[PDB]
Nucleic acid binder design. Structure first.
Lengths: 80, 150, 205, 123, 129, 80
RNA sequence: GCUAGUAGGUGGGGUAACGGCUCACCUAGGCGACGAUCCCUAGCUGGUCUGAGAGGAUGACCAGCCACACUGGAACUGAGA
RNA sequence: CCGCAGAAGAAGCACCGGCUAACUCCGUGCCAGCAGCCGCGGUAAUACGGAGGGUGCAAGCGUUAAUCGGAAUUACUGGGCGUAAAGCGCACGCAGGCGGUUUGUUAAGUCAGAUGUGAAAUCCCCGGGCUCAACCUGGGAACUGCAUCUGAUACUGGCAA
């Protein structure tokens, strides 16, 4: 099946675009300690309405604008 | 059967008014195909009796095995100065592993095939004093009895 | 190098003969043996540790005629096998053609055994060789040729062959100048001057 | 340091530097000569050792001890650097090898033939 | 009171073991209960009892062979700020060939030997000889 | 482009050939697609010096890719 | 400390195809110490060497990838430059 | 592969004070020079030079440069900080790291399994082919890894109480 990836909005202002920061467990190589290595990706909301902490589903696809490859597939929940 | 050899052999300088005072002392090897303890000096005024009297005194006392079938079952560690000396098992189909001071005491202790190495500084005077700290650290069958009987 | 020099002079400070011009002679026969080969470029004393430790390393090394490299390489196949490292080594060392021939009575001297294989008078199976090393194995057939049942050197080395027990792991035929290397060596009975534990310590770093 | 400290700053690593003053790029490099000098080494009882500024192309005008039995050199001559040193001289980076170019086989050292570029003698 | 529970446990255990104490106590939690079985089965404790009061506390009675119960190996492995994990065959092959090494598995808490062929990897908190 | 071809892997004055399906834009020793065979031209008796498959010399020759003259003449002599 | 097709949105246009690739308009955003921006140096990889291992070092021949052809720039035909 | 004479045409290079196996006699005399390091030589030098001898390697031998090893002497494996090299002069505190104890939930971390893939070459395991060996080569395992698919819920984390 498909893959949808858990991000959290953390910067919404611009129209039809939400900035999401995705925190996954990255391990150090030599010292083997997990850490949060946050990585923004630029997700396109269908209509912007988000803000901050909104868990979402995104997925890999075709671009629609420059630095895109991501869509909103569903809002798990909101926290704005 | 008794096994003994020599290790060091040297002389000591002291002074008493203008003394150079050379007196021939030494370290020696003790074992018995089980290991023994003792390593004494013996002051002398010639190189032959420096090792002679050294062996008298290095015959004092014995210490027991912890090998089964020529090798130790368990990796074990001890310490004395920067002579830190570790061993771990060595399977059958190998010869006698390790050079340094831990070549000679690692034969005489009944062993002919066990792994060894020494981390840190090898200070010959006390690697000896770190090697016998493994005949207090043992996983010999009495310890198997000391969880199954005890 | 293949040497080409004064065999018996080595005996002196070897403290053993190890088959230097055997055929009529050995220690203190028409030669000065068991001395020191120097006037006082070298003379007897108490010996150093490290002396011994080098000498014995060469002991094992010299009675096959193997170079520097080779014998180490054999060690790198032994400590690649999961069997006995000590055994394996002396196993590989006896695979050399030159050693095998001597122990089929062909050559009265170790050097002579190896100086046979040189001149075209040797062969193994129907294959002709002139190579002093070969892969020698169970149920091979060591064969003399035509014009080597003709040489008067070969015959003259059967003398001494009647005077050496010859191994039990090979057939030996002198009557048609064959013999097979029918099965593996035993070293349950050649390790009698060889302490494997010594040399393998040194080889290790 | 702490593993959490190391995640943030892994251990510093040593660097590489040698007796020759740059690790060079030859084991033998042809350098020109400025002048030969002769200092006395440390202590007033050490024997005089034959030294020389070099006139390297690298812009290293540094000082090379000159081995063998004296020399026949001229002071603009083109010599092969060994990149040894001898330890009784202070501050040394180079030592001169002989054989090839202007420097050639010294006399009555046909015993050390590998040294100095002395041929095998043919007697 | 305690930030890494288990570390405080073992500390007071070895400290007291050497003084040949009758018993020592320290605040119990779930795991503190589950460990004391291996120590009890191999014979290092008589038994252990959790007296639930204002809080559970483990007053485990210290066993001695003859004036000793000395153990030759210990570590804090998987602990705060350095919790780590291993798979089912990467369990430590400890001394004695029968030695123990507390591992929490994925269904319970077992030890290296059982845990191995039980298919079950997990964090090792420690290792014993 | 890809073709069935032979491909030396012998040393000097040893002709050990290996039948590969390999590119003509890389080489016969360059980028392989796949092995498919071994061949001895000298007809050695070593362990499996002749292989030539049935299944890939019947599938990549389905969508086209031609073999070589020795091979052509070998199809008959393994009676495939 | 950084950024004006800069960040994004509409609608146009363009590519074999997805894309500010490009534009007109619109919004005023975007990025940054989990190290941006800038500065030094370097073709990259399978692998290679050494080493008990971990690791470090390294990228020769051989294979794969990428890039370059007096210098710079530019377009043509074509599935392909 | 056969024949043809005739030992014929075929040994050198470094080293021998200690680390390090391997010295004597002369000449020299802190000069000459030697020397990886520790260090040699002041006229009875196992250390300099020659000779004699001895030692190790051998169609090579020795020297240098260079990289890793030894060196656990940058240390995750595998390091210290009273005085040996190291604890801010002392508090406060933002980010960060860290979280007593019990229950419910989740399954992200985590554990299990499955599936792709992890190029050829290379290693190894087993095994062959060249007169041997070098070299050539087959098949198996490795391909430590990664993503994907499904389960597990002890621990770690989230959520709730």
């Amino acid at each position: 099946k498909i893959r949808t990836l858990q991000g959290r909005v953390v910067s919404d202002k611009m129209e039809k675009s939400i900035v999401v920061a995705i925190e996954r467990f990255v391990k150090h190589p030599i010292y083997g300690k997990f850490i949060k290595r946050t990585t923004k990706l630029h997700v396109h909301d269908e209509n912007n309405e988000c803000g901050i902490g909104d868990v979402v589903e995104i997925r890999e696809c075709r671009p629609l604008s420059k630095t895109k490859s991501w869509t909103l597939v569903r809002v798990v929940e909101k926290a704005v | 059967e008794l096994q003994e050899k020599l290790i060091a052999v040297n002389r000591v300088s002291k002074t008493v008014k203008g003394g150079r005072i050379f007196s021939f002392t030494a370290l020696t090897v003790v074992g018995d195909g089980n290991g023994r303890v003792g390593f004494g000096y013996g002051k002398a005024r010639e190189v032959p009796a420096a090792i002679q009297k050294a062996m008298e005194k290095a015959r004092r006392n014995m210490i027991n095995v912890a090998l089964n079938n020529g090798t130790l079952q368990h990796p074990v560690k001890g310490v004395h100065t920067g002579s830190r000396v570790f061993m771990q098992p060595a399977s059958e189909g190998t010869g006698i592993i390790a050079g340094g001071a831990m070549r000679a005491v690692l034969e005489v202790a009944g062993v002919h095939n066990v792994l060894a190495k020494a981390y840190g500084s090898t200070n010959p005077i006390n690697v000896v004093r770190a090697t016998i700290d493994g005949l207090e650290n043992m996983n010999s069958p009495e310890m198997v009895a000391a969880k199954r009987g005890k | 190098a293949r040497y080409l020099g004064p065999k018996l002079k080595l005996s002196r400070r070897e403290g053993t003969d190890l088959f230097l011009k055997s055929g009529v002679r050995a220690i203190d026969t028409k030669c000065k043996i068991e001395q020191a080969p120097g006037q006082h470029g070298a003379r007897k004393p108490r010996l150093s540790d490290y002396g011994v430790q080098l000498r014995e390393k060469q002991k094992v090394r010299r009675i096959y005629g193997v170079l520097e490299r080779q014998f180490r390489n054999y060690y790198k196949e032994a400590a690649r096998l999961k069997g006995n490292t000590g055994e394996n080594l002396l196993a590989l060392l006896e695979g050399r053609l030159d050693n095998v021939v001597y122990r089929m009575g062909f050559g009265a001297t170790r050097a002579e055994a190896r100086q046979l294989v040189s001149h075209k008078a040797i062969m193994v199976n129907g294959r002709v060789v002139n190579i002093a090393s070969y892969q020698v194995s169970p149920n091979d057939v060591v064969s003399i040729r035509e014009k080597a049942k003709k040489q008067s050197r070969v015959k003259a080395a059967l003398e001494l062959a009647e005077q050496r027990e010859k191994p039990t792991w090979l057939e030996v035929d002198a009557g048609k100048m064959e013999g097979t290397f029918k099965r593996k060596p035993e070293r349950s009975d050649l390790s009698a001057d060889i302490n494997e534990h010594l040399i393998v310590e040194l080889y290790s770093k | 340091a702490t593993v959490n400290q190391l995640v943030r700053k892994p251990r510093a690593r040593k660097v590489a530097k040698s007796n020759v003053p740059a690790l060079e790029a030859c084991p033998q490099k042809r350098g020109v000569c400025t002048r030969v000098y002769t200092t006395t080494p440390k202590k007033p009882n050490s024997a005089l050792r034959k030294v020389c500024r070099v006139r390297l192309t690298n812009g290293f005008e540094v000082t090379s001890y000159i081995g063998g039995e004296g020399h026949n050199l001229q002071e603009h001559s083109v010599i092969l650097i060994r990149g040894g040193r001898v330890k009784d001289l202070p501050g040394v980076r180079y030592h001169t090898v002989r054989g090839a170019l202007d420097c050639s086989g010294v006399k009555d050292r046909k015993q050390a033939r590998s040294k100095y570029g002395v041929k095998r003698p043919k007697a | 009171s305690m930030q890494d529970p288990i570390a405080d446990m073992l500390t007071r255990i070895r400290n007291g073991q050497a003084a040949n104490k009758a018993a020592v106590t320290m605040p119990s939690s779930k795991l503190k209960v589950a460990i004391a079985n291996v120590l009890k089965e191999e014979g290092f404790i008589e038994d252990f009892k959790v007296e639930g009061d204002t809080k559970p506390e483990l007053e485990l009675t210290l066993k001695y062979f003859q004036g000793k119960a000395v153990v030759e190996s210990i570590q804090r492995v998987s602990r705060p700020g350095l919790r780590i994990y291993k798979r089912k065959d990467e369990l430590p092959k400890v001394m004695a060939g029968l030695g123990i090494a507390v591992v929490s598995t994925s269904k319970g808490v077992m030890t290296d030997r059982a845990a191995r062929q039980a298919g079950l990897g997990g964090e090792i908190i420690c290792y014993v000889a | 482009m890809v073709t069935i071809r032979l491909a030396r892997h012998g040393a000097k004055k040893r002709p050990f050939y290996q039948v590969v399906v390999a590119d003509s834009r890389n080489a016969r020793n360059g980028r392989f697609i796949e092995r498919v065979g071994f061949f001895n031209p000298i007809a050695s008796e070593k362990e499996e010096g002749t292989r030539l498959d049935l299944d890939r010399i019947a599938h990549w020759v389905g969508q086209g890719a031609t073999i070589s003259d020795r091979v052509a003449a070998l199809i008959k002599e393994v009676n495939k």
